[PDB]
Structures are given as C-alpha cells and as structure tokens.
C-alpha cells in the first residue's frame, strides 16, 4: 500500500546520500534509528500534507483527536477550557529528539517552548556539571527565555527518545497575552525555577 | 479522464490516514461527507492551480464568470460598479462549511468576512442560548470585528452545507477604505446589528 | 520530445476545466488563442524553472541573451551602461497581453511599469472617448503612477498581441533612486505627459 | 541508480532549452562545464532537499560533517568555539563560480560575504587596472560592505573554479553582533584593507 510504500523509499535516497559523502558510522546509525522511530511512531506519514487537504474546521477536529494526549497530560492544558485548546492545537508542532540529543543549550537566543508527550529530558547547567531536574510527560521547558526576556537559562538534553510539541515564540507570546490566568502560572514557575538554579 | 481520476485518489490516501490514527466514526463521516460535497460542487478540481496557468486578465475574466453568483445575490455587490467587482473578485476565497459547523465563535480575534452564496447560517450569542438571526444567500457576516474594532461579537454556525466566500481582513480593510460609499453601508449595518444584540 | 510534450498536456487539463464550469465561447477562445501564442512565442517553456537550475552569474548571462531585444529597442536602456542592464535584467518579467485586453485602467492604485518588446497599445482617457497616444516597441508606460505619486492617470489597452516586460514598483523605485540621470529623463517625460492629457 | 539517474536528466531539458533560444556557444559551454563540475563535486545531489528530511539536530550534525573543511581552513573559524560553529554552519550556503566569473563588482550594494573552500580569486579596482590581491582557501571577501557600511569597495573575479560559502547580510550582521571578539578581527582587517587600496 501507498506510503507504507513511499516512506520506504525516501530512506533509500537519504542512505545513498549518507554513503556518498561518507557520513560517520555513529551519525548514520542515528539517522537510521530516527527513521525507524519515525516509521513506527507516525508511520512516517505526512500529517503535514494530508491535513493540508482539509478545511479549517476539519483540520481543527482531526488535530484535536490525534494530538489529544498532550492537552491531557499537561495539568495546565486541562481546565484551560475549549477556547484555549482550539486556539493553540494547530500551533503545537510535533518534533522528535533522539536519546542524548541537545534540545536547548544554555546561552542560545531561542524562545521556543517544548511540551513533553513521551520520554524524559534532563535540565543542566551551562558546564553540564549540575543536573537541576529530570522532566517527563505532562511537563514543559523552554518557557523562561521569553518570560525572563533572556537567553536560554539552561541546557536541556533528551535522556530517551522524546515526542515533544514545539510552540514557536510568536504563538507562545500571543497565547501568553491572550490568557493572563495561564500566563500567571507559567510566569510563577519561571521565577520559581530561576530563584532556584 | 484526468482528475475525474486524481481526485478519486487523494481520498484514498486521506481515508487510509484516518484509519491508521483511528479517527472517530463521526469525524470520519464528516470528512467523507465533505469530500463527496467537494467532488459534486467543484468536481474537486483545483481551480486554485488551473487559474495559476493564466495571465492576470484571463484569470480575472474566468473568476468573474465562475464566481458571478455572489456579486449578483448580494445587493451591495451590484450597482457597486465594474471597478469594485474587478478589485475584489480575485480575493473572494471559496470555502465550504458542513452542517452544524462553527464558522465564527464569539470572542475570537479574527476579522475575516464571509459572503453566503449557498446555504444558511445562524447567528448566536456567546452562551448559544439566543438566536439573533438566520442568514442565507445574498447576506454576509463577520464584518463587525473590523468595523467596531472588536473581538467577534457573536457565534455563527452553519445550519446546512454552505458555500461561503471568505474575504481576508487586509483586503476587507483595503476595500473599505477604497470605497467609502459601500463602507458607509456596511458600517451602518454593523451599528444597527450592535444596537441590537 | 519533453515539453514539446508537456506543454501539450496542460492545455488538456485547462480546456477540460473550461468545459466543466461552461466558460463562455468568447473567453474559451481567448484562452486557447493565448496558449497558441504562448506555445509559438516561448514554446510554452518554463524559462522560469530552467533558469532556476543555474547559479546567479549564469542566469544573469542567459537572461541578458534571451532578453536582449528590450535593452536594445528602448533608447533609455542603451547608453545606460552595463551596470544598469545587469541590475534590472533579472527583474523584467515577460508578460503577454491579448488584443483588446486592458493592461491598465485609469484610477487604479498600481505602479507597475511596462516595456514594449513587441506589439502596440493605446493610451486612453478614463471614459475612453479620448485617445492620447499609440505606443509600440521601444516605448514604455505605467511610469506616471509612482513618479507623480498618484493613481493611474490613464487607461492602456493592447491593440494587438503584446510582449511586455513588467517591472514591479519596488524594483522600479529602487532603480529610479539608484540611477538619477535615467530617473531625470523618466520624470521629465511623466510631467510632459501630464501637462498634456 | 536514482539521481545518478535524475541529475543526468535535468541537463537534458536545460540543454534543449539552450538550443531553442539559440544561446551563444560560449555561454552554452560555460553552462555544460558548470554542470559537469556540479556532477563531480556534489554529484549534483540536492543536499538542499535530503537535509530537508532530517530534524534540526540531525541536519546540524550532517552539515557539520559534510562542510567541516571551511571551519578548518579559516583561522577565524577555528578557536571560535563550538557555539559559533553551530550558530553559523546552517547559514553557509555552498555556491560555485566558474573561472573568470564575477562574484562581486565594485560599486554594487550587496553585503553578502564569501568564504573560500577551494579555488582562488582576484581582488581588483573598479577599472580593473589594479590587482590588490589573490585570495584562496581559508581566506574570505565581501565583508567590507557591511562593516564600512558602504558599496562594494572592489571587484572580485574567480581565477579558477571556486567552491565558495556565501553568508547573507542578515546572518552576517547577526553573527557579528553575537560574537564581538570575532567581529573585532574582521573589522580590523576591513580597515587594514581600506587604508590600503
Ligand atoms: N525543571 C527545571 N527546568 C528549568 C530550570 N531552569 C531552567 N529550566 C528549564 O530549562 C530552561 C531551558 O532554558 P530556558 O531559559 O529555555 O527555560 C527553560 C526552563 O523551562 C530548573 O531549575 N528546573
Ligand atoms: N444578522 C445579524 N448578524 C449579527 C448580529 N450580531 C453580530 N452578527 C454577525 O455575526 C457576527 C459574527 O461576529 P463579528 O463580530 O464577526 O460580526 C458578525 C456579524 O456579521 C445580529 O444581531 N444580526
Ligand atoms: N504616451 C502617453 N502615455 C501617457 C499619457 N498619459 C499617461 N500615459 C501613460 O499611460 C499611463 C497609464 O497610467 P500611469 O499613470 O500608469 O502612467 C502611464 C503613462 O505611462 C500621455 O499623454 N501620452
Ligand atoms: N585581500 C584584499 N581584499 C580586499 C581589498 N579591498 C577590498 N577587498 C575585498 O574585496 C572586497 C569586495 O568588496 P567589499 O566591499 O565586498 O569587501 C571585499 C573585501 O573583502 C584589499 O585591499 N585586499
């Protein structure tokens, strides 16, 4: 069947590409390991480009069904109301991180925020000699950069394979200003996290 | 023949996608019902991407032929003149809404305006305990947000399948300022509608 | 051979599209007449998407070869120097207008300027009861809108099939400010044309 | 195999295109010579569109492997640290210039900077009667326009085939402000180069 059969073929080209510039065995394995994870988690199907078919209301509906877990697992996302969920659901970008991979490095100027569906990460100091926290499902990170209007306060490494939902700075900012009650909670956590650290 | 035969195949992939993440029977039926409506109303043909072939004047001409109904059915669109019709016709985006679907929710920050070619909608209060109006062909909604410079003053639900023409905020604003006489009429309706409600 | 054989097939879809929404015989003939002109003038080949293959210097070189006529036919374009020609050549968009078609209508807010490679046009008053000029190869129009910072001062209709080169407002403005000597000439013509009219 | 077999076919269309508008023998040879160089240097493979498959961390990793030479050959790029390399690596665009081709012309308003992986160039005065320098691997040019906030101070011609890495003005500016120590060095070279010349 179709991309049963098309997703098996994009790795055929990518692997060929990896051999021709002779990519290190370690990196090649990472890439193959990523695509194996992609094919079994999402079936490597462009949820990007089949939702593109649908009109707003039907994409909204589908998105809220396939991505229902994260609203659920995150205490801040539930009790937020239907309003909030509809407003943010189409802006939560699913992203996969391999074990040991760096999501955020302390000192960077990014302000994207990440929500943990599946997996766990570690929050580290800049020299990586200190571990401040392990974070897992229902918890989020990357919020302090925008709220404290500062560079990344810490380094965040995936401890395992991670299903994360990335929320861009603009939407994050837009959402923060549109929901003060939720914004107050995130702001307080951020200060709580920085009068720690 | 061609997309007689290509439009039958994009539903083959989308349906497969719906089964793999196990989308609810109700949502799956909505999607299939939408595409059946798409295939019989537009023959599911990319009027998007065949007009893309043509130069401005020929796209202008084709658009004014295939989308002649809405200029006609809307009293404000006729007597407006050739000037106005040419200026707006390529900015009226055809959009389909299924019965019972929410086009607008009271309190949202959108300013898109919708023109009803075919079908009917209901204008509701925020708690949906009050029905202010049923709107059908020749009538429009979604204009009060920009004119009153406010969030959506009401909720608008499709009562049936609807062929709507969406006009984006920027073009709506551009059109309003470019035609004061038409703008005066819309402004007056908006105030009339808000000293009701 | 290839798009010998692909350009014959895009008209197969477009014609089918024209029959399904039953486009007027007159408009259908215009469209077919346009594509016949396209296939014999350019061989309907995407000079758009084969130049896309090439690096800047080679696209620059090819553009200056295939589009050498207009630099030549326009007195203002020659003696301008290599500097000027290189700076503008990749911004002159080839556009085709059928006989009798409206390129510009008096009162519109566009500021695109057009250069006549092949064909002739007529410059008309707003009510089209007055003909101010016939313009042909080496001559240009659509410059007065930006220079007089005004709406289109007149209506311009193609008298024949026309090969025009469209120069967008931003590039036109950028070019005007970058070459004062050429700008002075265009400015003077524009005032000369408006203390006529 | 695949684009072993697809890259042989894009030249089939481009060559056909070159014959139909009868491109000069000299330009046709340049284009064929470019694509022969493309097919043997990169195997004409879209490193553009296979990296597009990968998530950020894996594209970052691959980019730093395939494009490791330039960080190495350029004294300013080494000792800069991992921070700097990660920040810039995905912004260094590989570009190929044929022998004798003009990369930069004195007086132009561009501010793109170029890093020489392979090949050599010559830095010339505006009238091209003076040769200020030959530049090769590990050296860069095109930095003075932004730093002196001026038009191109000189003309730069490829003496041979060149593998260059282009860094756009915005990223160049962003990088300059983000790393003052490296910025100081480039600024000093630019002044040193202009109190020469
Ligand atoms: N759990 C926990 N997360 C922290 C702490 N300090 C910073 N972070 C998270 O990791 C930080 C990563 O850098 P940001 O400044 O992106 O904000 C993110 C915070 O969400 C801490 O003490 N505990
Ligand atoms: N017909 C009718 N439409 C209304 C009324 N109040 C609001 N609307 C329409 O529905 C509103 C939807 O929210 P907007 O503020 O988008 O402006 C839209 C108005 O076009 C009303 O009293 N009658
Ligand atoms: N040849 C000629 N062209 C004119 C005259 N008046 C306006 N135009 C051209 O036609 C005008 C079309 O509107 P613009 O204001 O685009 O500027 C264009 C001018 O180039 C005129 O008297 N003679
Ligand atoms: N090597 C050398 N490069 C120069 C000199 N003057 C200008 N350039 C380089 O060539 C210049 C090309 O124009 P820019 O102003 O792009 O800045 C570039 C400088 O990198 C010079 O005297 N020596």
Numbering used by the authors:
A (entry chain A), B (entry chain A), C (entry chain A), D (entry chain A): 226 to 422
Give the article text.
We previously demonstrated that SthK is gated by cAMP, but not cGMP, and is relatively insensitive to voltage, which resembles the gating properties of certain eukaryote CNG channels. Using X-ray crystallography, we determined the 3-dimensional structures of the isolated C-linker/CNBD of SthK, termed SthK-Cterm, in complex with cAMP or cGMP. The C-linker domain is followed by the CNBD, which contains four helices (αA, αB, αP, αC) and eight β-strands arranged in a so-called β-roll, which is flanked by the A- and B-helices.
Additionally, the structure of SthK-Cterm in complex with cGMP, which is an antagonist, shows the SthK-Cterm in a more closed conformation which is similar to the conformations which were previously shown for HCN2 C-terminal structures. In the structure of cGMP-bound SthK-Cterm we observe that cGMP is able to bind in the cyclic nucleotide binding cavity from SthK. Moreover, the phosphoribose group from cGMP establishes the same interactions that were described earlier for the phosphoribose group from cAMP in the SthK-Cterm structure. Remarkably, we observe that cGMP is bound in its anti-conformation in SthK-Cterm whereas previously published cGMP-bound CNBD structures showed the cGMP molecule bound in its syn conformation. The anti-conformation in the cGMP-bound SthK-Cterm structure prevents the purine ring of cGMP from establishing binding interactions with the C-helix or Thr-378 from the CNBD. Therefore, it is possible that antagonism by cGMP arises from missing interactions between the purine ring of cGMP and the C-helix of SthK.
